[PDB]
Design a protein around this ligand. Structure first.
Ligand SMILES: [Zn+2]
Lengths: 36, 89, 116, 72, 90, 75, 78, 76
């Protein structure tokens, strides 16, 4: 009965999980390459 | 008293595999009472404007359309129409 | 009265309905006296600048409109005493002139002067 | 397009009636948008009241009810 | 059978009618007015609970909580416009 | 009583924006009441705007003044 | 008086949750005064409702009705 | 989540204002909690408005004049 409106937000969350994984990887890589 | 039993029934019907919290049930009851009061106050205003001595389905529909937003109001109006039809049936 | 007599000769306008010549300060504070309810000219300079117009000529010391050929000719016998003029060039907007007739106020052209 | 027809001199007159000693060049479009929003809300309320009353003509009474509902 | 069962709704049409007549919102109340009001209340409650259960399944929980209710209310634009001036404990 | 907006443009705007339900007459008194309400509303908004401008220490009101007024008001 | 009982850190924490980065010394007394006015109005309305109901003690329902009258509905305590 | 106002001072203030209004009164625990929640919400809303006023005034420090302007524009 409920409106029943869906949410691509789940696709957004998945895309954001991928972005967070890539972000952690790249941050670790750049900091290890820097090493002061 | 409160509408806790009815809220629990609706919850089991919409999501038969989930629960709720005590604060959540209280918030739902407060919401139910508030919506009831708002619609009743709007209906009383409309009846006093029309100089009527009985709140009718037309008054309730007008109150709902004045309170709730567009799409939500239309869906609620459809649900109420179906309900009153099944009742009069 | 002392409220309708112009105070300072500089900065002076005149109406188009009853042709009430006064000072800008008087028009802003008190406004049109002969026609106030059907004009709302009082309480702001905006309606003053909208209706009245500084394009007018002539000065007559009107003191007895009930008994005066100048008032009978100028059609100001039903107005209060004051300093009026003999010509006022202008015209009110359509929205301002239609409401006059709708409420029951006959709009006439006070510009008795001729053209060419 | 009548939102532009609303003479800017009219907005300036409405603003000049108190305190407003100086106005910018963008106030006109902003005031027009705000007036549009307010009119849309009031007219929606009045149209709801009229459809409830069944009449096909909005009335000053319906406008007053809409204003009271909005709390104006 | 009970008017609730007659109308097929889940909210109490009888309690709604009694509350209306007790508050004295009007000298009388029709027969369709209370059924309609109960139906509107039930639809609103069903929508709120649906959004709350959706938020709960997203958060990975087995019981709805005020957090899920808040998330649902602030994610639905219409519910936000409806309960903007509403406050909740905790 | 006093009206600053031209009644004809105001009526045109009302009938153009009242297309939510096409074909609906508006009595003269209804349009007049709407115009009075709109004039009073814009008057209050400009007063709040002048307050925000005086606060910001600027004698000239700017669109951000009106924006802040409406934000604090809850429009 | 107990109006001063409202701790300076409590007002600072309220302002932080609101979104204020730097507070002035004259803010705490003003916030206390505003809070006192609001509580006075709410208690006024609540005592009015209590006298209407002819009850000996103020209740969460009366407080909620007073808050509604003010225009700030509060769920949870219903 | 947690309460930002101290429960005991807030309760003492509530009792003080209640005695000022009418003596020999008693409030419920839930009533005092609801009052505290409503007061915290009201203060947070007021602080958000005051922060907007200060932002507009091109400042960082919030001022009692900002609070006054917020209350005015709100209409209290
Ligand atoms: Zn004149």
């Amino acid at each position: 009965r409920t409106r029943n409106e869906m949410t691509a937000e789940e696709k957004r969350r998945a895309h954001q999980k991928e972005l967070a994984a890539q972000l952690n990887e790249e941050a670790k890589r750049r900091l290890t390459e820097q090493k002061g | 008293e409160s509408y806790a039993i009815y809220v629990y029934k609706v919850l089991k019907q919409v999501h038969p595999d989930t629960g709720i919290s005590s604060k959540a049930m209280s918030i739902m009851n407060s919401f139910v009472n508030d919506v009831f009061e708002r619609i009743a106050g709007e209906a009383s205003r409309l009846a006093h404007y029309n100089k009527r001595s009985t709140i009718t389905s037309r008054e309730i529909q007008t109150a709902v359309r004045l309170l709730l937003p567009g799409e939500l109001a239309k869906h609620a109006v459809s649900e109420g129409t179906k309900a009153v039809t099944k009742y009069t049936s | 009265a002392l409220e309708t007599v112009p105070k300072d000769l500089r900065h002076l306008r005149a109406c188009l309905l009853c042709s009430l010549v006064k000072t800008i300060d008087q028009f802003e504070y008190d406004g049109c006296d002969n026609c106030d309810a059907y004009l709302q000219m009082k309480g702001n300079r905006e309606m003053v600048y909208d209706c009245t117009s500084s394009s007018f000529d002539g000065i007559i010391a009107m003191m007895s409109p009930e008994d005066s050929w100048v008032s009978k000719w100028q059609r100001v016998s039903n107005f209060k005493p004051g300093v009026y003029a003999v010509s006022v060039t202008g015209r009110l907007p359509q929205g301002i002139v239609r409401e006059l007739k709708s409420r029951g106020v006959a709009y006439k052209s006070r510009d008795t002067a001729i053209k060419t | 397009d009548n939102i532009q027809g609303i003479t800017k001199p009219a907005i300036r007159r409405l603003a000049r009636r108190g305190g407003v000693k100086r106005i910018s060049g963008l106030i006109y479009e902003e005031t027009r948008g705000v007036l549009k929003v307010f009119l849309e809300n009031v007219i929606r309320d009045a149209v709801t009241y009229t459809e409830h009353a069944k009449r096909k003509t909005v009335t000053a009474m319906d406008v007053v009810y809409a204003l009271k509902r909005q709390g104006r | 059978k009970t008017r609730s069962s007659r109308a097929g709704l889940q909210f109490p049409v009888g309690r709604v009618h009694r509350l209306l007549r007790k508050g004295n919102y009007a000298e009388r109340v029709g027969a369709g007015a209370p059924v309609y009001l109960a139906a509107v209340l039930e639809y609103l409650t069903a929508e709120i609970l649906e959004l709350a259960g959706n938020a709960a399944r997203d958060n990975k929980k087995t019981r709805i909580i005020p957090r899920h209710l808040q998330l649902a209310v602030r994610n639905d634009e219409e519910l936000n416009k409806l309960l903007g001036r509403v406050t909740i404990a905790q | 009583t006093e009206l600053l907006i031209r009644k004809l443009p105001f009526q045109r705007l009302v009938r153009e924006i009242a297309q939510f339900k096409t074909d609906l007459r508006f009595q003269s008194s209804a349009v007049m009441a709407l115009q009075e309400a709109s004039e009073a509303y814009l008057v209050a908004l400009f007063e709040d705007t002048n307050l925000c401008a005086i606060h910001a220490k600027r004698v000239t009101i700017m669109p951000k003044d009106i924006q802040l007024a409406r934000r604090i008001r809850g429009e």
